[PDB]
Symmetry: D2
Subunit: 454 residues, 4 copies
């Protein structure tokens, strides 16, 4: 079932039009997995909604405006995602997605007003849906709205859950004393609470970093039009559209103070990617630490008992693996690659317009989503159920050579050397040698007194 | 609308219209990372259907009942053929060995094979997901096997044929523009002449060499881990199984799959994937250059360079080099993907690298993007490019680079005087030569011949 | 002429004209990786001078004899002031805690302080490298402290002043060019008008935003690990040492250093360096764009765009009349590509901490300092040898207006 | 000081230096990054080789043999590292490296003039451009020097370092061939493999690194010389390109050839990206090897403790830091960032000339030399002295609950899993549990559960 638009066949069941069909014919790169990410499309919904309402100030008939507003909300609410077939690998201004949005909002609005789909009557994609706007200033506007929403709704709440779970564990483990490891080698004592407090600070700081990388994300290009001058838009449009987006989202969007910078570069997305990159480094460390600390159960480090969620092996009967650590550390690796892709696009602006926009936002949204979702999965399915193997930890304290120093201000090396050579404990050796009693060793050597400055 | 199934952790509801089982349901519950766009790539799923098909045939030499084997071979074929893709809901961001996808595959094939035999789905009867579908295998050696199969098919069916179109199209264009002389540019400044054909021949060479680089990075992709089992020893597999399955995979694909000579290296690392991603990274550099040049050479129509007229396939009356944009975006993405692969590859622990899903996702992503982009750039840009000869001819006549042609005919000092004079006055060399009185228009035309400025 | 010192593996000749000792010599043998270009960065050595100077003055509170502390303070100052650079032969590619450089520092300062007090070089008397120079310290908390001191100082003295000069020169040119109307380019295609001042204002905003980004990426660089000792607990150090040492370093430098609130996080990761590198990475993206634009806009003399006349910085060629190569554009864009690579190196090291200690420390600071210095110096060089000398070809800019297919004075803002 | 001149004013040139006015102006105009950023000596030496080859060939094209002879001698001195102090320029110069080409022409001119008994700074009788640069461009000489430098560094530094490490790892693999250890997958206790088998994996990775690097070398052997300004070879003599490549081939003993397409050779440095690609793979391999050895040597008592690594530091008693593992893993991380640098430069060619050349070759050489030296140092100071803790290895392996895998073909997966879970709940042996469970006799367990039988297929 098709309709003719114009000279192109458009499926009768689709709201897009000829310019979207036109764009599908020539950009068949990577197929449907490569379709423009949903948050971009939704963000466009919010944009076209904002612009339509504001445009009533500049001669937009309220009947048309209201229908566009309603159609856009449907877009923004993810109700019309099947009407967006274009890939990331399209024109690098993202204009083809802008046209897609205009066409879909036009035809849904037209339907709503009882017109014929494809007619451009009474809602015209360019004259009404794109009123006061351009390709060059719309896609970057959507990018930033989409990035900020993803950070506030997915990324930061994920991190917060992780931070809170780690902090709870740190408190739970505050009196559990284990052997430090530096260079992977046995080192002086600290609590599991202390070590976990390190992970907490890193996630606290990851969140601080991401927040720090947001102010320029809230700057919107809308109003720059073709080259940043604002040619062919109305005075005040730029500001009023930013403000409507802010009020619709509850986020502090403002018009970009320099539209040339806003269109010719996407340095804010590179900045935000940079924050996610630091965050990936932090999470790699935390998840890899917990992976190793949970290793065994018998012939690894064995300090942590990680929740068992599924079987690990068809051959090795009863094996269970730290599979949440793995998804998280894989996501961390992906984010680091995503960042280089964003950097290469960001660096490759030409004169008035950076035309790597779709790829940059694809990578930013992918990193943000992966990090947010992994942080929740890792929290709910690993961190919250972590228990300490205190038997193992306690045995490893009593079997370590790192406590020998406690005896220095009592008896004055040979214990440690002999214990090391004989394979025995510090206590066993001290007694075998006859330098102290079993009661004495217990008096002198108190690991709870080895956990701070004196 | 659900049936009840079981694994060793216990009982789970599975939707009646799905061939997967309890461990797949379990994975969906525990790995909610990224959503549907993050599903295990289809090439890995199809590759698994190839492998399981191969395993099931060979396993008849090791006891597997023919009735069971046949059914398994037919199910696995439907997986390989892309008939069962909706029965694979699991994401890339799962266990780092890809075990959960292995189990997805075992379950989907087990159930389709049971249905073909009129058994009850989810019963493990008569085709058990582990004891039959996964006979003589481990997640540890099967997921690497599927990766390399997937990788090789994508290179052979998508990447290389894409690059071949592009090579051939650039080379035809090189030939077509062999007689068109333009001003070379070095540091972006006017240099000395070369033909448009010569310039395009550099691109042809770059693409030829990209293909050679990809092919050079393939030998260790053909090495399959299958047979290493849990840690690379082959524990619980019969001798000969490694080699028989690798050969069956070769015969099923027409590609030179062989058994990895060191199964520890094959499980503990995915250096071959890093190598291949490396070749694609070079290819992305070559393509960035070609497509950026073509973009700039087509710039204008009036205040750019304006040497090439690129096909107008859509509206910008404005129209933009939109295929060059797609392609240079793809190229940038490949470079990022390459770092993701390298970080994953760098991070093996002891007997198993557990970054496998992420590594093959990026390699496959890069291969499909480069291949598809190459076809699109060829068909929708390269083949239609025309030279704006009226513009190129006008720029030749207005360049100051040709004045050295006058040296032997009038001396260096008069030749230098002309360039300096035309430079200050904004005039042609010829105008200034004639105005200064050093020569006639007829002498200037006989003396300054850019076609004699094209070789040693 | 040499002296003989010993370490746990043997006697060693130490040249009598050097203030380092046995441990340094042994490190030169055991880490023969890369050569003289790979030497630990001078800013790290200098930052060690400041740190050991602070620790020595502070350690008087915790029993360090004043005559020993004063010699150590003096000798440390000479290290900090760059008077002893030749006594640090060690490469970046050493232990990942940078222990050997801490030992280098301790040895050098010991032997210079010994000499000031009139003792025998190589003797550990009366100034002992571990017991006095390293007093209250660990290699694990000293190298991170020196890294952050080095990075902040390089950010303040080199990177930010470099970018400031560039911002100011671009802005000057934006103003100078504010009334020159040119053709905009989008997708490289001819577009609607903008001024050259307008286009240049984009570049000015980018550099302003770069400095903003870099300053935003500093707060956690000011946190110092000193006091965390071996694993973060501060075991075997004295209560109040962490704070006193950070406060002394803050007074010594005039930068706002503080003790890291969480020492485990301070030792186990260098996420602040990754953050700072990320800001330089964005800056590199900005500069790549500015420098490449200026490159293309200056193209010609007749087959390019020809909007800008760039100052000549090379001899002319007779074979190519009028060719003027954008030399600083090339210097800057190479530097930009370099910072992007360096950032990946920092990221990989950052990601690879183990338990109580990240042992990728030397390479992470080397990359950070490399990027900072290249960006600062390239920003000053690009300013003084390109930007300030830029002229517009108003004849050609304009002629390509009455030639464009796109009153232009009435097309530069909204209606 | 002597006085010399360029188009921008008078320049003092130190009497004790062989460089000239263009070099001096370059030190003034490219003050980026300081001394560590000086152009790599391998590049300088490689230019020595090229200018030696060019001088000898140019005797076919009008070069006075007296002059040529003196240029050859001076060029040999550069190539032998006798004149390193006369190259003050940084990597961060023009993107074609023209200032280094100028530096080399000035130095060779002046040292040649001094050999002929003329005046330093005079361009008489050896002109830096008319003689030392005869038949050459700035645009084809720097790429030629890049590839000569890269090829030499691969053959003299990188491949021999890797070879040594390969041989040391293979020796250790043989030494450990009968030590049965526990495999770890996902870091979890697994089934046995020998320590020799685990080390055989490292051995294969280094073998393959060397194969990868050699596979990435063919297009590095391609030389741009003769391409001149844009690839066309305008203003050079026919046969110069072929003759200089052959002379470079002959001087070095490496299979250098002329680039079959000079446009590709000048407009891109894809071969450097390719070579860097091979080093990046190599870095992943070394990261894994060095990280494993690090972790395997962890202890003395709260780590894995399977390996005893050599002491490289003063003595926390018993603590032996894996210092070489640390140097090697830092180096591996650096090669990965360097690869990005090379990639960004290589991606950014314009029209007839890629102007990222100095940066690209600096990163390639930096990666080759760090990998080569680190591999030697890792071999000599770690790998050759590695010992096994056989007592600890044995106990760690015997304790693995996943030895129960042995019982699969005898009693089935489900009953092996119950043995394992209940051994893990109770803290019992596998044997104590299976006897108590009624699943096997003590004797059937001993005959079914034998680690020395789990090392290969049935």
């Amino acid at each position: 079932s098709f309709r003719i638009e114009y000279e192109l066949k458009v499926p009768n069941d689709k709201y897009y039009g000829a310019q979207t069909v036109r764009s599908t014919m020539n950009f068949k790169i990577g197929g449907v997995t490569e379709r423009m990410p949903t948050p971009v499309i939704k963000a466009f919904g919010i944009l076209k909604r904002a612009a339509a309402e504001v445009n009533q100030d500049y001669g937009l008939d309220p009947k048309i405006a209201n229908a566009i507003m309603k159609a856009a909300d449907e877009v923004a609410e993810g109700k019309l995602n099947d009407h967006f077939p274009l890939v990331v690998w399209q024109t690098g201004s993202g204009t083809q997605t802008n046209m897609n949005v205009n066409e879909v909002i036009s035809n849904r609005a037209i339907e709503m007003l009882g017109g014929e789909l494809g007619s451009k009557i009474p809602v015209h994609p360019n004259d009404h849906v794109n009123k006061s706007q351009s390709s060059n200033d719309t896609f970057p506007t959507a990018m930033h709205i989409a990035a900020a929403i993803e950070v506030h709704e997915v990324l930061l709440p994920g991190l917060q859950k992780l931070h809170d779970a780690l902090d709870a564990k740190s408190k739970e483990f505050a009196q559990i004393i284990k052997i430090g490891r530096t260079h992977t080698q046995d080192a002086v004592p600290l609590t599991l609470g202390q070590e976990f407090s390190g992970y907490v600070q890193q996630v606290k700081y990851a969140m601080t970093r991401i927040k720090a990388a947001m102010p320029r994300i809230y700057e919107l290009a809308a109003g720059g039009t073709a080259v940043g001058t604002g040619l062919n838009t109305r005075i005040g449009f730029a500001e009023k559209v930013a403000a409507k987006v802010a009020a619709l989202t509850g986020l502090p969007f403002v018009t970009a103070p320099n539209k040339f910078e806003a269109l010719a570069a996407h340095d804010a997305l590179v900045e935000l990617s940079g924050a996610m990159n630091t965050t990936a480094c932090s999470l790699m460390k935390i998840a890899n630490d917990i992976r190793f600390l949970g290793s065994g159960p018998r012939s690894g480090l064995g300090e942590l008992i990680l929740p068992e969620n599924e079987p690990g092996s068809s051959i090795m009967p009863g094996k269970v693996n730290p599979t949440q650590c793995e998804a998280m550390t894989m996501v961390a690796a992906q984010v680091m690659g995503n960042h280089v892709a964003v950097t290469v696009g960001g660096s490759n602006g030409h004169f008035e317009l950076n035309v790597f926009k779709p790829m940059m936002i694809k990578n930013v949204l992918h990193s943000a989503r992966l990090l947010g979702d992994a942080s929740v999965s890792f929290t709910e399915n690993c961190v919250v159920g972590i228990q300490a193997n205190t038997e193992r930890i306690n045995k490893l304290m009593n079997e370590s050579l790192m406590l020998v120093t406690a005896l220095n201000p009592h008896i004055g090396a040979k214990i440690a050397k002999t214990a090391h050579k004989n394979g025995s404990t510090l206590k066993e050796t001290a007694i075998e040698l006859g330098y102290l009693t079993a009661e004495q060793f217990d008096e002198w050597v108190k690991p709870k007194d080895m956990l701070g400055p004196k």
